[PDB]
Design a protein around this ligand. Structure first.
Ligand SMILES: C/C(=C/C(=O)O)C(=O)O
Ligand code: SF4
Ligand SMILES: [Cl-]
Ligand SMILES: [Cl-]
Ligand SMILES: [Cl-]
Ligand SMILES: [N+]
Length: 303
């Protein structure tokens, strides 16, 4: 015919030409999810980055996630389609916060949420995500741990493990998940009285306390089989992910306006441009990468 390739067809050809895999987070735009080879949460993306047979990883997610993939694949090309795909919560944690906490608690393990920079991870004894933070902290050989950046996840970990949690920094949080309120819980239950509530641990504690399940986005997918109707208290693109996986269930956003600007820096067009031009190359300095890798590997061994 007269027509040629659209962006999807161009991307598919370039993936072949580059020997590339596209890894996407659950918060990516639906049309980006639809072209990804693998979609998952922070822990699943970290694990998947340890079995990459491709030469090139295009990371449809934020920069810290691409850096984690690069730390696990120092000799593969890792591309981030936009350097403005970044995480507001992760940037709240600086090396100075970690050093001050280590000074006060030298025997406390430093436990850093994967939502953190590579420089910060170089000071972690182990990394965690929302899916394994409780399990990891429970198993660490200390009754006190230094933990960050997210204070709402820290609250959940403190509740579930009974251990003393020293937050770094003092007020780290995700603006997307902080948008959920008790009024959103009330409205969701009024509009969808037969639905259960799946709530991310980055939400505030009083909202966590209303959950039927508290889970990472990966845990939400794992536990969705437990009911047929769910209100989803996380970034709104997760509703698309859940509807695609389970077309027979019903999913409703807790708030349509819970959007991550950094995640939406990734577009179909800049994924195309990323493969076409081999950009933007993600690099992590060797000393930081080796130290971060030790903490990330330990995390994968512990969960
Ligand atoms: C936002 C997020 C973070 C994580 O997995 O630790 C999630 O995908 O649940
Ligand atoms: S949703 Fe929140 S934690 Fe995730 S990248 Fe966006 S700002 Fe960061
Ligand atoms: Cl692969
Ligand atoms: Cl995220
Ligand atoms: Cl199913
Ligand atoms: N011990």
């Amino acid at each position: 015919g007269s027509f040629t390739m659209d962006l999807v067809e161009e991307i598919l050809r370039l993936k072949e030409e580059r020997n590339a895999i596209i890894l996407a987070h659950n918060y990516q735009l639906p049309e980006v999810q639809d072209i990804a080879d693998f979609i998952g949460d922070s822990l699943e993306l970290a694990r998947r980055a340890t079995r990459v047979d491709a030469d090139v990883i295009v990371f449809a997610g934020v920069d810290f996630m691409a850096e984690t993939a690069k730390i696990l694949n120092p000799d593969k090309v890792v591309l981030i389609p936009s350097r403005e795909a970044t995480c507001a919560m992760a940037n709240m944690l600086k090396v100075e916060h970690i050093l001050e906490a280590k000074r006060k608690y030298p025997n406390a393990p430093v436990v850093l949420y994967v939502n953190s920079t590579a420089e910060a991870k170089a000071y972690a004894d182990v990394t965690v995500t929302s899916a394994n933070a409780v399990e990891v902290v429970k198993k660490l050989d200390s009754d006190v741990v230094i933990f960050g950046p997210d204070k709402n996840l820290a609250h959940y970990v403190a509740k579930m493990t009974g251990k003393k949690i020293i937050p770094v920094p003092s007020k780290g949080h995700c603006y997307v998940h902080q948008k959920f309120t008790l009024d959103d819980v009330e409205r969701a239950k009024k509009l969808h009285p037969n639905a259960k509530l799946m709530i991310h641990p980055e939400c505030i504690p009083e909202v966590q306390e209303k959950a039927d399940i508290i889970a990472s986005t990966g845990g939400m997918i794992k536990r969705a089989c437990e009911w047929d109707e769910w209100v989803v208290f996380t970034e709104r693109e997760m509703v698309y992910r859940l509807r695609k996986l389970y077309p027979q269930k019903k999913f409703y956003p807790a708030r349509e306006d819970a959007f991550c600007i950094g995640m939406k820096a990734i577009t179909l067009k800049n994924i195309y441009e990323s493969l076409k031009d081999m950009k933007y190359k993600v690099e992590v300095p060797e000393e930081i990468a080796r130290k971060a890798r030790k903490a990330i590997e330990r995390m994968l061994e512990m969960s």
